[PDB]
Amino acid sequence: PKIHYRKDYKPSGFIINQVTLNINIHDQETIVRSVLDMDISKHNVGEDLVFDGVGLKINEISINNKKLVEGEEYTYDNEFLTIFSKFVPKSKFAFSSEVIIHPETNYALTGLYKSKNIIVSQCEATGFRRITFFIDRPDMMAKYDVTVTADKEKYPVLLSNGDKVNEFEIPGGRHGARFNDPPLKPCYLFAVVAGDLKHLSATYITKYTKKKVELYVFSEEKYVSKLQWALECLKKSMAFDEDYFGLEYDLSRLNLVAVSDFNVGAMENKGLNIFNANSLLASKKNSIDFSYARILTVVGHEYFHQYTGNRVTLRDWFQLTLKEGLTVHRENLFSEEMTKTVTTRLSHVDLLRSVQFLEDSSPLSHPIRPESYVSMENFYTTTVYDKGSEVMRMYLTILGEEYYKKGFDIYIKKNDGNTATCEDFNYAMEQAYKMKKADNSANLNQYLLWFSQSGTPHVSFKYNYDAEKKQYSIHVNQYTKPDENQKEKKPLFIPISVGLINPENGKEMISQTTLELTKESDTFVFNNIAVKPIPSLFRGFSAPVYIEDQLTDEERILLLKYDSDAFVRYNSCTNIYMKQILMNYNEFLKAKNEKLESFQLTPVNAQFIDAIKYLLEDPHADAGFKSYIVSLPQDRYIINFVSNLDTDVLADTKEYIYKQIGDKLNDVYYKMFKSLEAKADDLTYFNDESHVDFDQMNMRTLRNTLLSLLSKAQYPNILNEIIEHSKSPYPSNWLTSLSVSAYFDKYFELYDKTYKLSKDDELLLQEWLKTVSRSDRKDIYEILKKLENEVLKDSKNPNDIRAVYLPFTNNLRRFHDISGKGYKLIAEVITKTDKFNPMVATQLCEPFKLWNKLDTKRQELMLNEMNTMLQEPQISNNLKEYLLRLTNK
Ligand SMILES: CC(C)(C)C(=O)N[C@@H](C(=O)NO)c1ccc(Br)cc1
Ligand SMILES: [Mg+2]
Ligand SMILES: [Mg+2]
Ligand SMILES: [Zn+2]
Numbered sequence: 107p108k109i110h111y112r113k114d115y116k117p118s119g120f121i122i123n124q125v126t127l128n129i130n131i132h133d134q135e136t137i138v139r140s141v142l143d144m145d146i147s148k149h150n151v152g153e154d155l156v157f158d159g160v161g162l163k164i165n166e167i168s169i170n171n172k173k174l175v176e177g178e179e180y181t182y183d184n185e186f187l188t189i190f191s192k193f194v195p196k197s198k199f200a201f202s203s204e205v206i207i208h209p210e211t212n213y214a215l216t217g218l219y220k221s222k223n224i225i226v227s228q229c230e231a232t233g234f235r236r237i238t239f240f241i242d243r244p245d246m247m248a249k250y251d252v253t254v255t256a257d258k259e260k261y262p263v264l265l266s267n268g269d270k271v272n273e274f275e276i277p278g279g280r281h282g283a284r285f286n287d288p289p290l291k292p293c294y295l296f297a298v299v300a301g302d303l304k305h306l307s308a309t310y311i312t313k314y315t316k317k318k319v320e321l322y323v324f325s326e327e328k329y330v331s332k333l334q335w336a337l338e339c340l341k342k343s344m345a346f347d348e349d350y351f352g353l354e355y356d357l358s359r360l361n362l363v364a365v366s367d368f369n370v371g372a373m374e375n376k377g378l379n380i381f382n383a384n385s386l387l388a389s390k391k392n393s394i395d396f397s398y399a400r401i402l403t404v405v406g407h408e409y410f411h412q413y414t415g416n417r418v419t420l421r422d423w424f425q426l427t428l429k430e431g432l433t434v435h436r437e438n439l440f441s442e443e444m445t446k447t448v449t450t451r452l453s454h455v456d457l458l459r460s461v462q463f464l465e466d467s468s469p470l471s472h473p474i475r476p477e478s479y480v481s482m483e484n485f486y487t488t489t490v491y492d493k494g495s496e497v498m499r500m501y502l503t504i505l506g507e508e509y510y511k512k513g514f515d516i517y518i519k520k521n522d523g524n525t526a527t528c529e530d531f532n533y534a535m536e537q538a539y540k541m542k543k544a545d546n547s548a549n550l551n552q553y554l555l556w557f558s559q560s561g562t563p564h565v566s567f568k569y570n571y572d573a574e575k576k577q578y579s580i581h582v583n584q585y586t587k588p589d590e591n592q593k594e595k596k597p598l599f600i601p602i603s604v605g606l607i608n609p610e611n612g613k614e615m616i617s618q619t620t621l622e623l624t625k626e627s628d629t630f631v632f633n634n635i636a637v638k639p640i641p642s643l644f645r646g647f648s649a650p651v652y653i654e655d656q657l658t659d660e661e662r663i664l665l666l667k668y669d670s671d672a673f674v675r676y677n678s679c680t681n682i683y684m685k686q687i688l689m690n691y692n693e694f695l696k697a698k699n700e701k702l703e704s705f706q707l708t709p710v711n712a713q714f715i716d717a718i719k720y721l722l723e724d725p726h727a728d729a730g731f732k733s734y735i736v737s738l739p740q741d742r743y744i745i746n747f748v749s750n751l752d753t754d755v756l757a758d759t760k761e762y763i764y765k766q767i768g769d770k771l772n773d774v775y776y777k778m779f780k781s782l783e784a785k786a787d788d789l790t791y792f793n794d795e796s797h798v799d800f801d802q803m804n805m806r807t808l809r810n811t812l813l814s815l816l817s818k819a820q821y822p823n824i825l826n827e828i829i830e831h832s833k834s835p836y837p838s839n840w841l842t843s844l845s846v847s848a849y850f851d852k853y854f855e856l857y858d859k860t861y862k863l864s865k866d867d868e869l870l871l872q873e874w875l876k877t878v879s880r881s882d883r884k885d886i887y888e889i890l891k892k893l894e895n896e897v898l899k900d901s902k903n904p905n906d907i908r909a910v911y912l913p914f915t916n917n918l919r920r921f922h923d924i925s926g927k928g929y930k931l932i933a934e935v936i937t938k939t940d941k942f943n944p945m946v947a948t949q950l951c952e953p954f955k956l957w958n959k960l961d962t963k964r965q966e967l968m969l970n971e972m973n974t975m976l977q978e979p980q981i982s983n984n985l986k987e988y989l990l991r992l993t994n995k
Contacts, residue, residue, distance in 0.1 A: 107987065111478050112424040118241055119150035122248045125293075127238070129218075131225055131256040131300060135206050136218060137165075140238040142201040142248075155194045155201075157187040158235035158242035160217075163206040167239070170199055187239050203239050212236075213902045213942035221367035222326065224301035225261065226380060228373060231423060231482045234293040244420045245525050247290035255282040256300050263324070265299040265361055267291070267376045287376070290523070292419055297375030299363050304330040306337050312355060313348040320359040325387060329364070329868070332387035334795035336362060339402045343409040346440045351514060353413050362386060362405065366868060367903055369945045370486070371404045374411035381408075384869050384905055390792050392867040395803040395838040399450075403441050410436040413518060421525040423482045427474040427557070428528050430486070431494020435502075438495060445800040448672035449730035455647045455673060458496065460740040462488040463652075466562045467746055468955050469994045471589055475528055475557040480987040483945055496650040497556045501535050503601045503620060503648050505542055513538030528557050552624060553599045560591040563598055565623075566654040571638040578606070578635040583627035584651070590994075597626045600649045605642035605671065606635065609661075612668030615639050620648065640664055645671040652746075655681060663717045672731065679735050680743075682714050683763075687744060690759045698755060710766040718767065719774055729782070730804030733811045736775075738763060741918055745959050752961045753922040760918075768819045776821060779812045787834060803838075810842040817846035818882075825850050832856055837863075837870065841877045848881045871897075872909040880913035886920050887927070904946045911935055915953040922960070926967035929953075933971035936985070937978050944982035951988060969993065 124143035130136060164182060167174045169189070174180050180189045212219035217236025218227050227237065235242040252266045258281045264270075268287025275281050303324040310319040321340055323333045340362065347353045361378045368382035385404040388397040414436060415429035442450045465471065465488055474494040476485050502510040517534035536550040568581040582602065586595035600623040606615035621630050640661045644653055655678075657665075662678040669675050689708045697705040718735055721727050738760055745751050768775075786805035791797040813831065816824045828850070832843035844860045847853045857878070864874035875893065883889055890910070898910050911932060915921050921928040932953055940947035957968040975981065976989050 107480050107983065109478055109480055110482075112422070112476065115422050115424070117147065117149045118243070118246060119147050119153050120155065120241060121145040121147050122241060122246050125240075125248045125250045125252075127250070127252040129252065129254045129298060131209075131254070131261065133257070134208075134210075136209055136225075137204065137206055138238050139204045140202065142240075143198070144201055145198045146196055152191050154191045155189040156241075157189075157201075157239035158185075158232070159187045159205075159239040160185055160232075160236045161207070162236075162239065165204040165206060167201070167203040169193065169195065169201055171202070201239075205238060207237065214945070215367055215369050215904070215943060216945070218298070219367070221365040223260070224303070224326065224365050225256070225299065226301075226363070226365050227296070227298050227375075228369065228380070229296050229375075230294040230373060231486075232294075234296055237296075240293050242293060243422070244292040244294060245422060247292060247419075247525075249290060250287040250296065251284070252287070252296075252298065253282055253284045254298055254300060255280055260302065261300040263299070263301055263303040265297075265324075265363070265378055267295070267297060267378055269358065291376055291416070295374070295376045295416060295419075297373070297378045297380060299324075299361075299378065299380070302327065303363065306330070306333045308337055308341065310341060310344055310355070313345075314352075315354055317354070317358075319344075319355050319357070322359065322361045323386070324361065324363040325383070326364075326366075329383070329387050332389045332392070333364075335388050335398060335798065336364075336381075336386045336401055336405055338796050339405040340409065342402070342444055343406045343440060346406075346443060347410060347413070347436075350439065350443075351413075351436075351511070353518070355412065356417070360409075362408075366905070369904055369943070372408050374408040374415055376412075376416050379405075379408040381405075382905070384872065387869060389795060391835065391837075392870045393837060394841060394873050395806060395836070397869075398798050398803070399441070399445070399800070402444060403437050406440045407433055407437040410440070417523065418518065418521045419525050421527050423479070423485075424475055424477075425527050426482075426485065427490045427494035427497075428526060428531060430491050431474060432498045432531070434491050434495035435498035438499070447730055447800050447804060448728060449734070449804060450800075451646065452672060452676050452731070452734060454492070454495075455676075456734075456740065456743075458488070458492050458650060460742040462492050462650075463562055463746050464742050464956055465489055466493070466560065467587075467959075469590070469958065469992055470955060470988075471560045471591065473558050473560040473591065477591070481984045483984055484948060484988050493650050496647075500556070500601055500649060503603060503646075504599075504622070505535065505538050509538040509542045510535075512541065529554070532557075550599070552597075555596055555598050559586065559595060559598065561586045561589050561595065563600065563649075563651040564654065565600065565602075565644075565649070565651045567641070567643065567656050569641065569656070571635070573638070576633065576635050578632040578639060580604070580621075580630045580632075580641060581627070582621070582623055582630065584623060585626075597624065599624055600651065602643065603645035603648035605645060605669070605674075606632070606639035607642055607665065607669055608637060609640050609664055610637060612664070614670065642669050642671055642674045644677075645674055647673045647677075653677065653681075657681070659685065659711050659714060663711075663713055666717055666735070667720060676731070676734055680739050682711065683739055684744070684747060686710055686763060687738070687756075687759055688747060690762055691748065691755060694755045694758050694762075695752060698752070707762060710763055715767055715770050719771055722771070722774055722778060728804070729786075729801070729808040733804070733808040736767075736771075736811060736815065741916065742956070745956055748959070750961045751959055753918050753964065754924070757919045764815070764818070768815060772816060772819055772821055775812045775816055776824075779809055779816065779827070782809050787836065787839065789835060792835060806836065806838055810838065810846075813842060814846050817849050820849065825852065828852070828856075832859060837873065841873060844874075845877050845881050848883050853881070853883070869905075872905050875906070875909035876913045879910055880916070882917070884920075886914065886917060887931075890914060890931070902942055904943065904949075907935070907939060907946065908949065911950060912952070921953065922964060924963065926964075926971070929968050929971045933975050937975055937981075940978070940982050940985045941980065944984035947982065947985050948988045951985070951992070954992060957992070 122144050126141040128139040179193045209218045209220045216228050216233040254264045264283035266285035268285045271286045272284040304327045305322050305324045308321045323337050357377050364381045364383045364386040366383050371385045372381040410433050414432045474490050513535045540546050540548050563584050563586045565584050570579040602621040604619050608615050659682050662682050665678040666675050693707050782805050786809050828843050828847050832840045834840050844856045847856045864870040936947050936950045972989050
């Protein structure tokens with residue numbers, strides 16, 4: 107296993123100036139001819155010419171139109187093409203090759219592959235080497251001239267980067283298209299698409315240069331009517347980057363293409379973005395509400411890459427977070443502006459503090475700029491993406507909007523058309539930091555620790571108030587637990603957005619303030635504070651940290667009701683919940699350990715329940731926010747606070763807490779579920795695919811959340827509401843009716859009903875699969891078997907496999923069955939999947955990420971299955987490295 111190190115970076119001894127491709131798609135094979143106009147770089151030391159080339163069938167290779175003989179002049183081991191230096195020229199030369207590949211049987215979905223009836227490429231990060239020989243690394247910038255030929259019947263639409271400069275007929279019912287893309291680009295941004303595609307189109311005129319940009323969105327003919335929202339999101343994305351960042355699109359045309367088989371969400375190939383179908387296609391009749399936020403973010407994400415990723419690219423893959431973390435940040439700013447709901451920001455924080463915090467306290471923990479990798483695909487992580495985004499967002503919090511836009515502009519102008527590192531961005535921000543602080547002595551050298559230091563910082567507080575002097579103090583410290591990456595952790599630059607709430611009237615006591623914590627501990631003092639305040643800390647979640655507010659539940663309730671910041675309210679609620687959960691957990695645990703005949707449980711705080719009722723009944727309060735407060739924290743958030751987690755005890759704990767709150771508020775829940783119906787399920791714009799109301803969708807989220815609570819509680823005659831719910835035109839509703847019916851005898855009745863509604867739409871069926879997979883059923887294992895035999899079968903579609911299994915993995919009581927059969931089931935799916943798709947195989951390993959946080963029995967069970975997987979003779983490099991790191995080997 108070759109290990110690559112960040113410290114070992116050095117420029118290539120070679121240069122690739124021009125790439126001339128001929129791609130020749132036939133029924134049984136695809137022939138790829140490539141001419142590389144190359145040169146010798148100043149870093150050259152007469153070394154062998156080594157190309158990346160994975161799974162290529164060599165017909166012939168040449169240097170300056172002279173054939174190379176195998177063995178005497180070169181060797182090829184199906185991974186590297188090694189041309190001995192004595193046969194390598196010392197000036198400008200041309201390398202050429204003709205190889206054969208087979209997209210039809212490429213089920214790894216990397217390189218060139220077939221998705222249903224569409225030929226499509228995926229080259230990031232190391233996919234281009236699976237198409238032809240190349241020095242497959244992002245710092246090898248080249249010009250591209252690409253010709254694609256194919257059967258005209260089967261592949262009328264041909265697409266690649268750049269401008270289409272020629273179209274021509276070919277004898278035998280074939281045709282060709284030539285694409286010239288003069289601007290330099292890394293090879294992972296190369297793309298090609300061939301198929302019977304249908305499209306929607308529009309013309310966008312840029313804000314400043316008034317340039318006409320042709321926008322095209324593609325899909326297979328059957329789903330062409332699901333492209334409308336995507337086109338709207340693209341227009342929105344272009345407008346936002348113009349309005350916020352002052353950035354216009356520089357090309358004549360932008361294509362978006364949806365394919366059914368895709369490993370991730372989408373890919374930002376220059377002028378040819380390629381999407382997972384579930385992240386581009388939607389209709390109000392055939393999609394759940396989440397699809398609309400999903401498509402908005404993903405279309406937005408790929409578009410913002412055009413500057414942060416494409417025009418300013420990476421020096422090496424260790425700088426991945428520079429384009430991904432920064433683009434997610436831009437996507438988040440975009441989404442918050444478009445949705446105009448507080449739940450947008452809350453949803454990102456909810457994701458980070460559950461999934462990413464878990465990762466960062468697991469053996470897989472890494473900094474957003476990793477120090478090493480075996481398979482780069484294994485580091486496209488929530489750490490690199492989402493913690494990266496938070497690190498990028500903190501710049502904005504520190505600098506403020508005005509100076510952040512100035513610093514960002516410096517970064518773009520100074521690095522446009524070039525490769526860049528994380529240091530380059532921090533430099534640009536430091537320039538704005540100097541301007542803001544009004545002295546050239548200020549620097550952001552400490553901030554670089556955010557890129558290099560792994561683990562989640564812990565921030566705790568102590569408060570003091572002197573009523574006589576009207577003086578308030580906030581004593582703060584930070585701490586990061588040592589791990590396998592850093593022996594000693596250093597204090598980070600932590601920006602703490604704070605407010606001070608007057609507990610008597612709920613008003614703000616000070617103006618907007620961001621405390622800059624740069625030491626291990628500090629004391630921030632405030633004068634002229636009339637009364638003892640309740641601190642509103644880390645407003646907007648201003649830093650990716652564990653917050654320990656040290657507030658009483660009384661104080662947290664007051665913030666929940668009266669604070670102005672959405673997150674702090676949300677977090678105060680979260681902290682009240684966590685305290686309750688941890689208390690009841692230990693009480694349940696001690697009773698189990700000591701085998702007690704009787705014991706007591708601490709009831710849920712009555713004033714807390716009163717506060718929930720208060721908010722729920724407030725008509726001016728946000729429906730989305732309401733759905734969060736009636737929901738306990740994510741299991742993966744909770745586990746970060748519990749050692750040797752007994753999943754049954756946690757399940758017991760949650761059930762007790764929900765029942766306590768339900769026994770008081772169920773009537774309020776039902777009353778709200780009925781009153782929200784009119785606005786939530788309004789059909790006025792059901793046939794307008796460009797009209798999306800995120801507030802209305804939040805109301806539906808609240809209704810479906812309340813319905814779930816009422817169903818679990820077996821509320822009187824709630825089954826009637828469930829039946830009526832199944833007749834709703836909105837998929838979010840009638841799929842909800844399926845999952846909540848799990849607690850009734852009518853489940854399999856709705857199972858068949860919803861299946862018939864879903865079966866004729868590829869994406870809708872996959873949502874149905876997720877709904878079934880996540881169903882709280884005692885017979886879920888029998889149900890999964892039914893899905894495998896009747897629906898899933900032999901499908902190699904990642905959307906299909908992930909839909910069937912991943913939701914089930916979050917079933918706290920059933921997946922973590924003490925027999926370990928849940929662990930055995932997924933390990934079998936992982937090993938099975940690994941034979942044709944290593945990336946998705948590692949994706950299916952997500953349940954095992956918390957293995958060492960569980961009780962000793964469940965630890966042993968998970969560990970056994972992972973060791974079983976590790977001993978599979980044909981295990982991929984991706985899966986092997988992932989499991990080796992996860993199990994600390
Ligand atoms: C769902 C989400 C994580 C946002 C995604 O699609 N990421 C892309 C990406 O960054 N597109 O620009 C992605 C692309 C390549 C690889 Br390998 C992994 C993830
Ligand atoms: Mg091959
Ligand atoms: Mg299919
Ligand atoms: Zn991206």
